[PDB]
């Protein structure tokens, strides 16, 4: 399960998730990519699940590029405790997803098989996705 090897701080303010993904939204490594059309969180378990599904369908061919990395920690409180007494404990890690961001990219496959694998993986994600190909300007 992906997570940073070391961080400056353990705990992080909640924050809000607004705007669009202007930066990581262009195919830059392969031929075909899957993109988020909605916003949400993506835990490390979902990242690994979709990676396994894609690489199982693709028959270990081509290459898969993961372009999302989960680096924001999320805390929780233990069960049956009251509302004060400090911040909880880190339980898992997420990546924030704004609409437009490329999640996965595939290389070295004809588009039909890539689309079958992407349709398999889009069923294990919490938000709506789309498929995109490379283009010049």
């Amino acid at each position: 399960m992906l997570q940073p090897k070391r961080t400056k701080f353990r705990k992080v303010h909640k924050g809000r998730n607004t705007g669009l993904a202007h930066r990581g939204s262009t195919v830059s490594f392969g031929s075909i990519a899957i993109k988020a059309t909605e916003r949400g969180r993506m835990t490390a378990r979902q990242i690994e699940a979709a990676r396994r599904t894609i690489s199982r369908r693709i028959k270990r061919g081509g290459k898969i590029f993961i372009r999302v990395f989960p680096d924001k920690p999320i805390t929780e409180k233990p069960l049956e405790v009251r509302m004060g007494n400090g911040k909880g404990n880190v339980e898992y890690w997420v990546c924030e997803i704004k609409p437009g961001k490329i999640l996965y990219e595939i290389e070295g496959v004809n588009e039909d098989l890539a689309r079958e694998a992407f349709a398999l993986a889009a069923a294990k994600l919490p938000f709506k996705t789309t498929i995109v190909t490379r283009t010049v300007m």
């Binding site: 669009l20 993904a21 202007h22 939204s25 993109k35 059309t37 609409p99 437009g100 995109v132 010049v136 300007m137």
Partner: protein
């Protein structure tokens, strides 16, 4: 040989609200610069430009832009696409 039939985009049609009104009726803003003349703001038709952007030869040879008895020989320089939908939003054209 490609040709995009444009129309003039004066002030009070430039800005953020004016450009959103333009796009809400399927038109695309654009700018033409280069050479020794001043830039020229322009409005193109979205379906025309979408149709042109599917041919790989449109990105290489000289395109003709007609803003009304005024023909310009330009190459496409930059393009802004929407991040979620791939809809083009702005196009830059260098006088060539």
């Amino acid at each position: 040989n490609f040709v995009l039939n444009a129309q003039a985009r004066a002030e009070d049609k430039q800005g953020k609200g004016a450009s959103r009104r333009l796009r809400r009726e399927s038109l695309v803003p654009a700018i033409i610069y280069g050479g020794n003349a001043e830039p020229v703001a322009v409005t193109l038709e979205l379906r025309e430009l979408v149709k042109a952007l599917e041919s790989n030869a449109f990105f290489e040879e000289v395109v003709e832009i007609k803003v009304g008895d005024k023909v310009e020989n330009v190459k496409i320089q930059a393009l802004q696409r929407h991040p979620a939908k791939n809809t083009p939003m702005h196009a830059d054209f260098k006088r060539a």
